[PDB]
Amino acid sequence: TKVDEYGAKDYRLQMPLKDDHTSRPLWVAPDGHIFLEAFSPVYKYAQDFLVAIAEPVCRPTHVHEYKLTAYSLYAAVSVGLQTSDITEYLRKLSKTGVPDGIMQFIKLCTVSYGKVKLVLKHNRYFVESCHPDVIQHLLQDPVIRECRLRQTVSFEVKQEMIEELQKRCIHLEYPLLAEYDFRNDSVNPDINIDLKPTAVLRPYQEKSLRKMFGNGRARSGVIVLPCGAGKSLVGVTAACTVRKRCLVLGNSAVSVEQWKAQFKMWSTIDDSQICRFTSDAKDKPIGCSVAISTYSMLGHTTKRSWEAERVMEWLKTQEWGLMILDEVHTIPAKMFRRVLTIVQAHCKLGLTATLVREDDKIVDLNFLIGPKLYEANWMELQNNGYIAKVQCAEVWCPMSPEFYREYVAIKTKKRILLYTMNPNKFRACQFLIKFHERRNDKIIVFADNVFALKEYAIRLNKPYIYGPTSQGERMQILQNFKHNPKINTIFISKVGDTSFDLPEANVLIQISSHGGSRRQEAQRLGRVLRAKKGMVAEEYNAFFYSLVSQDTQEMAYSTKRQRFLVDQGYSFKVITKLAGMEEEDLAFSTKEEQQQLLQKVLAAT
Amino acid sequence: VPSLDKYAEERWEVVLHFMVGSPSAAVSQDLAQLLSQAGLMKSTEPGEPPCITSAGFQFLLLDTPAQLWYFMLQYLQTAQSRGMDLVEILSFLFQLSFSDSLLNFLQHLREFGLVFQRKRKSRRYYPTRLAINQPGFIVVETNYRLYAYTESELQIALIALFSEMLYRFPNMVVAQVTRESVQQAIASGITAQQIIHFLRTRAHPVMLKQTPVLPPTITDQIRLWELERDRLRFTEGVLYNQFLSQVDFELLLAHARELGVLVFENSAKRLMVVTPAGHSDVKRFWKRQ
């Protein structure tokens, strides 16, 4: 804990320096942070080891940084590692040794795995273990006894208190082992899901499944892959391997439609077996082997409609061998997490790309779903050509003097509308759409603010998608954007910031945003992150523009929301001005037009 | 010969250590005042150690060849002022490239690490490599993170000028180039181009293969942070308005332009601003009528 003169953490009385440190690529500080050299010969092995034991903090091209935490080590033991194996390999890779604090810290976070198990059988939840001592210790705890239902020893628990049970079990250093032995479960009939031969999984998809299916049992946890990496196939492949009734929870009605398409594309399950449970329509969920729904539909708190209530009754009175939770980052929400207790699932597979939140509830995923089974590297997939090479750029749009006159004074929450509807920002967006459309590029324009979304869309005369747009109407827009040559650019809102699979979307322009949401920024960039048809790995296939207004709070938010992407190695170029704007017939080119816009913005309040 | 280069580097480094606020540095009143009168240091209080002037920080970030040359040039200029003929010392430098004043000059050169007698200040002297007139160690990331493979406190001190030091290891130091750190360095006197040049020259071999070796975003963002401070261009001047004589306003404008005093002008509003140095001259011209 010593601090240098330059506020730096001095760690030399803590650890010595090894002799052949040149070959060793790893620094292990007593703080738990680990720094890896990406240019070392043994980087590949070190990267695989570190991501299992430590969740990445930042992974630029040259030097990566990982942090050692209790949850990260608990994930390491789950996949198969042992304390001796972890400390032995870490010491071998470490070029300065493992400080005594870290050595004991690793040991502490590994003698707790497998002691206690949670088993779901015959619609009843039992906390089972082979060691009566730990079970008795759990019983001593008050809340553990409170949630009890009112050799190997198992005591039944009530479903509504699983989350409290799981949460406390973590606090007691006795995490519940939520592992499903699907291969030895004849109670639940096997489904006819099969992975068709045409599906050839990518190396990172296979690795992620191997971590989930390392042993015969299926591990419940979170698999993290870059947006557009192919998480759907991992979910489909997980369902194919388990071969039991699978429940898939998307983020929106568009996501479940894509999920249904993925199952048909990558699996031999017939369409009659696949069912959707959404407000728009349902394919008879009472009879269905693979059920696809949304958090909003299942997580609804108010009394449901009769048609939806009948489906909910069937879902509640069912045992699911695999619950795929798409966009896991939204689970820790107050009502979305309730969905886990509502549905009785054996294995809960979490799929996400941005395991971040602006609150501290992201860690709840450890006791809600499970440890992070895998986390792929964005740059490694980028270089390998599995995801598009995105040139992130931040376009600085100087704030109009008449608009800025109002912005500097007004502070009653009217700023967001004021600097979002910046005439300069509109002109930059209009020019970028004009420039890239001439390049046969497919543009997605994201606007969190609906007023700005409509304003740009009608003014530019482009289709736009947001809350009120019906599921059928927005699905038609996506289909036209995918296939119609005339439709080259679409406007989307907070609705489509996730789960929108647009393989050919080359360009993405962001004109409005919700605070400093790192998740929203990273998720939005994911729309144009799919591998392109004739893509080349090192040719910058896709482009990402984040239009911001200078001398405005959006500049502060812009840096905040770029934190996750830079941690992945993405560099955000700054574009103070765009060449060719002057010679382009852009709107708001006269003070009269700008004055009219400001009055409308002020009126909107 | 192999020891001469080490001697010169160590002797020059300790001078650099003294320049920065390093308690462990060579103590020498003559050197301390020599730096103070060199334009890159100022004490104002002999009892207390001197601080670093605005030009002092700029001098530190310079490369060793240019860094040494600037000091030598300042030494030559001060040689005449202190009473030492420039020609005598200049000839000695030329001889090195290929009396009491010479002895004093030689002693100062030894203090700088350029020369070393090695025989208790004998007549014969062995000039070092620097007397006639290095692999990089910093890895710059796209997230404003510097990983400098340094064992010396001087290089850490130089990097710490424009960055926040996070972790320290014997063969690596983790630093972050934040806006606050860069802005503080710019305020102290450093310029962005010096920081990019400082990082560029001390660039890890891993960064050399990629072009540009320094990622453009890091180099650009440093420049933008520098440009942020000078968003407003303050310039003292005297404003003239109420130009009733519109015809004569142009004549005054031409007169101001001829004298070179005009700084800014607005013909549409019939006004102009002139530096106070020439304010009297234009005032006299107007009074003449």
């Binding site: 040139q391 750029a393 420039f435 390049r439 046969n440 910058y540 482009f543 170029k573 700054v574 574009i575 103070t576 001005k577 765009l578 060449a579 | 962005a192 181009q193 453009p216 180099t219 650009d220 420049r223 933008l224 520098e226 440009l227």
Partner: peptide, 15 residues
Amino acid sequence: AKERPIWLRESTVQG
């Protein structure tokens, strides 16, 4: 063959 735009290709910073 559809080269990148100037603003993306090279820095637009005055410095």
